[PDB]
Amino acid sequence: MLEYPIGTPQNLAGMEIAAVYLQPIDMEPEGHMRKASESDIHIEADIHALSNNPNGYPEGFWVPFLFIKYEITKVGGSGAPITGDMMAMVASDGPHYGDNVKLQGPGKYKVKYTIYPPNAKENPMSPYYGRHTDRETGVRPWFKTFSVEWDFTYAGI
Amino acid sequence: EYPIGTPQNLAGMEIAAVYLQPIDMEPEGHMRKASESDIHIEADIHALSNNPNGYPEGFWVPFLFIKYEITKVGGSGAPITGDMMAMVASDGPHYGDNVKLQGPGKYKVKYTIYPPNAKENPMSPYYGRHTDRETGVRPWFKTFSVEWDFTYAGI
Numbered sequence: 682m683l684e685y686p687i688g689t690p691q692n693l694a695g696m697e698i699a700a701v702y703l704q705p706i707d708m709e710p711e712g713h714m715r716k717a718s719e720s721d722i723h724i725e726a727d728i729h730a731l732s733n734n735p736n737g738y739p740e741g742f743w744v745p746f747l748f749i750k751y752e753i754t755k756v757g758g759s760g761a762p763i764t765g766d767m768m769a770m771v772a773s774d775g776p777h778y779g780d781n782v783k784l785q786g787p788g789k790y791k792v793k794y795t796i797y798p799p800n801a802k803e804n805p806m807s808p809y810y811g812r813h814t815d816r817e818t819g820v821r822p823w824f825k826t827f828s829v830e831w832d833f834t835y836a837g838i
Numbered sequence: 839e840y841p842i843g844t845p846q847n848l849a850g851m852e853i854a855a856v857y858l859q860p861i862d863m864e865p866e867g868h869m870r871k872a873s874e875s876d877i878h879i880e881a882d883i884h885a886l887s888n889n890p891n892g893y894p895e896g897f898w899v900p901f902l903f904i905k906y907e908i909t910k911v912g913g914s915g916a917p918i919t920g921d922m923m924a925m926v927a928s929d930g931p932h933y934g935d936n937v938k939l940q941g942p943g944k945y946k947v948k949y950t951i952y953p954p955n956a957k958e959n960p961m962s963p964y965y966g967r968h969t970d971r972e973t974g975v976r977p978w979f980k981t982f983s984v985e986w987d988f989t990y991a992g993i
């Protein structure tokens with residue numbers, strides 16, 4: 682699949698956190714994404730386990746049941762961020778966290794993701810995902826909510 | 839880990855059934871307590887090559903909902919029923935449940951696998967699927983069931 686990377690990936694808590702963007706998409710169920718015709722991009726968080734991930738994920742596996750909030754700010758604009766929540770979904774290249782976003786024209790932007798673990802109060806998927814805690818098959822506790830930032834230049838795609 | 843027959847290949851996925859000792863899980867109060875169970879039953883679901891829903895080969899298939907039915911051969915005739923829950927363990931993510939069985943002997947195991955958009959799937963409002971030409975994938979598989987036979991001896 683064809684995508685545009687936003688900066689360089691960041692490694693935190695045995696996970697690789699990468700930011701990418703593409704053209705606005707169409708998704709099932711309908712009515713969750715902002716219509717493709719009213720958006721500029723599909724913003725995406727690519728989260729995969731690294732070697733020796735402490736939550737039992739083999740290397741390169743998708744990290745599931747996370748909750749991602751984003752804030753996008755145009756450099757030299759109003760000063761008010763474009764905010765939203767991502768949603769977990771699958772595309773031709775595999776599962777990810779994404780959202781159709783309307784930007785504020787060509788320019789430099791700051792992108793911030795707030796990544797919530799599966800047990801966070803803010804994560805709506807918390808009652809649906811568990812973690813083994815016994816000695817023989819258990820894993821380490823979940824990481825705590827954290828934020829990651831990148832810069833990028835948007836020209837129009 | 840103890841196997842429940844042979845894995846079955848359906849709708850671009852490998853579906854395998856296994857069991858091991860009852861486990862402990864966070865959040866507490868979802869699993870039947872390890873001390874009140876005989877086994878932890880699992881559904882191991884991974885994508886095959888050319889999976890029609892965009893999953894690369896060997897990837898875990900997420901946001902599924904699995905219902906199981908376990909009936910002891912020669913017993914009452916009434917199945918032990920339940921819902922599995924998605925979780926992670928040292929060997930990776932899977933769908934599992936702590937289960938109390940009815941003694942050693944032969945059992946029939948049936949899993950009903952619900953796609954992410956099924957009415958019965960409680961995770962349906964939280965998982966999407968791209969449908970556009972450039973990044974889209976094929977529609978979800980329809981709900982299906984898989985069965986195996988196994989002999990239970992214990993621990």
Ligand SMILES: [Cu+2]
Nearest residue numbers: 770778779780
């Ligand atoms: Cu997406």
Ligand SMILES: [Cu+2]
Nearest residue numbers: 925927934935
């Ligand atoms: Cu389990």
Ligand SMILES: [Mg+2]
Nearest residue numbers: 684701774777
């Ligand atoms: Mg991608």
Ligand SMILES: [Mg+2]
Nearest residue numbers: 815861862872
């Ligand atoms: Mg214990």
Ligand SMILES: [Mg+2]
Nearest residue numbers: 839880929932
């Ligand atoms: Mg296993």
